[PDB]
UniProtKB/TrEMBL annotation, chain A:
Residue intervals of the Phage capsid-like C-terminal domain: 10-289
Part of the full-length chain shown: 101 to 397 of 398
Protein name as annotated: Phage major capsid protein, HK97 family
Chain segments annotated as transmembrane: none
Organismal lineage: Bacteria, Pseudomonadati, Pseudomonadota, Alphaproteobacteria, Rhodobacterales
Location within or outside the cell: Virion
From TrEMBL, chain C:
Localization in the cell: Virion
Record's protein name: Phage major capsid protein, HK97 family
Residues of the full protein shown: 206 to 253 of 398
Length: 291, 48, 48, 48, 9, 48
């Protein structure tokens, strides 16, 4: 019962208090799920039905004998609706003696890992066992825009932005996207692209671009899965993802604790299943740095 | 067991969303059950 | 079809509201014999 | 994993945990105020 | 959330 | 328009029918809660 600094003379009674909730490193939740079309679906697939064309009108005369006109042709896009599963191994000695609720901490942390791991598939994912991101959708340069492709505009100089008229590749990308889709559109970038855009400045040293972290009035999603400013990379995307990109999923996270296979372990098998590609090809434009 | 998987279609058939900025929302839209509408403007004014 | 025809009509009347001529369609404001501003009459639209 | 239907899922990584200890020190000041002042100095010197 | 024998894991 | 037709899926899925004549309806069925059942028969009869 002496001082509380040396262990022997009354320093073992000090009993440090642990935290209330076990904390963690906090990673990026800008996941493109909050700007796309989220659809609950309990099936093997989800089949959106879009129209790649429109009709025709007449401006009929008084005595005209009005003939046939066009009628929109329909395209079905099949969401494959893959699954995303993780199975961490936890010890039964830990779970009985580790008074934090480890079941709900893993149910928070696996769900965080899934909401971060599906954000890679929504942007740069390929077809195999994962949703195909919008970057892997056979881009064709804007102006020669067919339906089965996404449009890009090119900046000029090969590595960086344009040499003389930089920031003009951004604005024709904005006004090359359609008047209706720009009513609620957004940039998507990663942070070391947004830093390079913010470092652009005028001839006198002042940076020309004056929560939403918005640029030119339109919101910006700071992702972390888009490519950086490379030779032929698509570092900046812009579009109305609420019409453009469809995410198909189930709004639950299935947990199965397994004290049976790994016998002194608990082995939480957790899975959610999620799918999605683009639904409207006209609603996303890209910024290629080629020429 | 692959024939039992029944891909769910969309709820409402979507489409390409073309421009609705149509000048109808900024002008004077007037209901008329006739052949023709005749506005009557003043091209001049009075004197005081 | 009643939604798609309505969208097509609300988009097709926007072309006639702006650049339409007289024949069977509304005459848009671009086809109204533009006369330069300052020398402005009532039967014409001004421009700079 | 992005697991397949025939994946036979293996062990995945587990987050490793770090404990950081706040030693929770103290801070003490001892002002000396007079009894005559506290009795005769109508401003509440204790709460001041 | 791994074993309770090593501190870091 | 052929994409949006979506055939029905025959709400109760059927199979090939196999015969259920199984000799349980002519033989004697004994409920047994043990590892084994015995019978005690008489291979011979008495004398007079």
């Amino acid at each position: 019962a002496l001082n509380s600094a040396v262990a022997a003379e009354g320093g073992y009674l000090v009993d440090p208090q642990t935290s209330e909730t076990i904390r963690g490193v906090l990673r990026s939740t800008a996941s493109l799920r909050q700007i796309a079309s989220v659809v609950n679906v309990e099936a093997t697939s989800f089949d959106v039905l879009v129209d790649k064309t429109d009709m025709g009108s007449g401006w009929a005369s008084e005595t005209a004998a009005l003939s046939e006109t066009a009628t929109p042709q329909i395209d079905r896009i099949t969401i494959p609706l893959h699954e995303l599963a993780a199975m961490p191994k936890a010890s039964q000695r830990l779970l009985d003696d580790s008074a934090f609720d480890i079941e709900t901490w893993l149910a928070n942390r696996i769900a965080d890992k899934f909401a971060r791991a599906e954000a890679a598939a929504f942007i740069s994912g390929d077809g195999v066992d994962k949703p195909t991101g919008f970057l892997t959708k056979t881009k064709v340069a804007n102006g020669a825009w067919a339906w089965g492709s996404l449009g890009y505009v090119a900046t000029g100089a090969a590595g960086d932005f344009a040499a003389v008229n930089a920031s003009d590749a951004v604005v024709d990308l904005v006004y090359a996207l359609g008047a209706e889709y720009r009513a609620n559109a957004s940039f998507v970038m990663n942070s070391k692209t947004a830093g390079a855009v913010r470092k652009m400045k005028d001839a006198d040293g002042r940076f020309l671009w004056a929560e939403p972290a918005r640029l030119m009035g339109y919101p910006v999603l700071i992702a972390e899965d888009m490519p950086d400013i490379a030779a032929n990379a698509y570092a900046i995307a812009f579009g109305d993802f609420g019409n453009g990109y469809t995410i198909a999923e189930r709004p639950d996270l299935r947990v199965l604790r397994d004290p049976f296979s790994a016998k002194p372990h608990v082995l939480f098998y957790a899975s959610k299943r999620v799918g999605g590609d683009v639904s409207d090809f006209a609603a996303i434009k890209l910024l290629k740095f080629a020429a």
